[PDB]
Amino acid sequence: KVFGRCELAAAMKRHGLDNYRGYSLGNWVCAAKFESNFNTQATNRNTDGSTDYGILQINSRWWCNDGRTPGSRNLCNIPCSALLSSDITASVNCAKKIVSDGNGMNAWVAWRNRCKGTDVQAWIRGCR
DSSP: OBOOHHHHHHHHHHTTOTTBTTBOHHHHHHHHHHHHTTBTTOEEEOTTSOEEETTTTEETTTTOBOSOSTTOOOTTOSBGGGGGSSSTHHHHHHHHHHTTSSSGGGGSHHHHHHTTTSOGGGGSTTOO
16 A cells, blocks of 8 residues: 555554654654655565565564575564555554664664654644
8 A cells, every 4th residue: 555645644643653762753754755655565675685574664684574584583573474564553563663672763774864854844744
């Protein structure tokens, strides 16, 4: 599923991402935009053989199991295919554990390079 800007903002707000660990809702929407273009089925292969999955491009190296990343961890305890669902529940729950491990949202390269230090509030402007 390809989410709308305000549609995803409402969904994320309901799952308790607004102000989670000090990060306003605008940051999460901005991250989703430049990681997957609001597409839940987005996948990308990394050089080391791992793969990013879903709306927030979560790495199979540490967080999920896809069965083809030798010597990797499954810290979110889910198959990576569950992150491609039209229901973002799995992706949100896993992202909460990632943002809490010390590095914050710096774990997402696109947020660090294209969202950090900008007016992220603009991403939720106009939404009910």
